[PDB]
């Protein structure tokens, strides 16, 4: 960018330029896998949490 | 005219000035000047010189 206004900075008026970085991403988890005739609730993920006591 | 500049993204000394050129108009206007020289036909005949040439 060499003419845009970004964050209130007028680039061309100030001899500035900017680099505009972006990417587009998505996420999905397949987490209630088939287990028989009856629909089941699961997760492929388990968590370990720190010792809370003192 | 040009100006000296800073580099600040936010302070008023980092901004390049705007400026004008300008034109104006002079004019020729045609004006007339003139004279009429009346003379009597007998005087013009009796003179020794061509008073119309004069």
- Contact predicate A13/A6, CB 8 Å: no
* Experimental structure resolution, Å: 2.6
Distance CA A7, CA A49 (A): 40
- Contact predicate A27/A37, CB 8 Å: no
Give residue ranges of B with CB < 8 Å to any A CB. 5, 7-10, 14-16
- Residue A6 pairs in a beta bridge with A9
Which helix or strand (DSSP H or E) is residue B41 part of?
helix B41-46
B3 Cβ neighbours under 8 A, 6+ residues apart: B16, B17
* Contact between B15 and A14 using a beta-carbon 8 Å cutoff: yes
Distance CA B21, CA B16 (A): 16
Distance CA A49, CA A14 (A): 51
Distance CA B9, CA B15 (A): 8
- Residue A5 pairs in a beta bridge with A10
Three-state DSSP at B12 gives helix
Question: For residue B14, what are its two tokens?
Answer: 């980092």
Contacts with B, A 15-34, CB within 8 Å: 15-16
């Amino acid at each position: 960018l060499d003419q845009a206004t970004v964050g209130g900075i007028n680039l061309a008026e100030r001899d500035m330029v900017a680099l505009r970085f972006c990417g587009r991403f998505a996420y999905a988890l397949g987490d209630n896998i088939a287990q028989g005739r009856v629909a089941a609730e699961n997760s492929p993920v388990a968590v370990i949490t720190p010792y809370a006591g003192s | 005219h040009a100006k000296w500049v800073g580099e600040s993204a936010t302070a008023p000394e980092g901004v390049k000035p705007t400026a004008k050129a300008t034109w104006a108009n002079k004019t020729l206007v045609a004006e007339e000047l003139a004279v009429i020289l009346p003379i009597h036909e007998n005087v013009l005949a009796d003179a020794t010189e061509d008073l119309l040439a004069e």
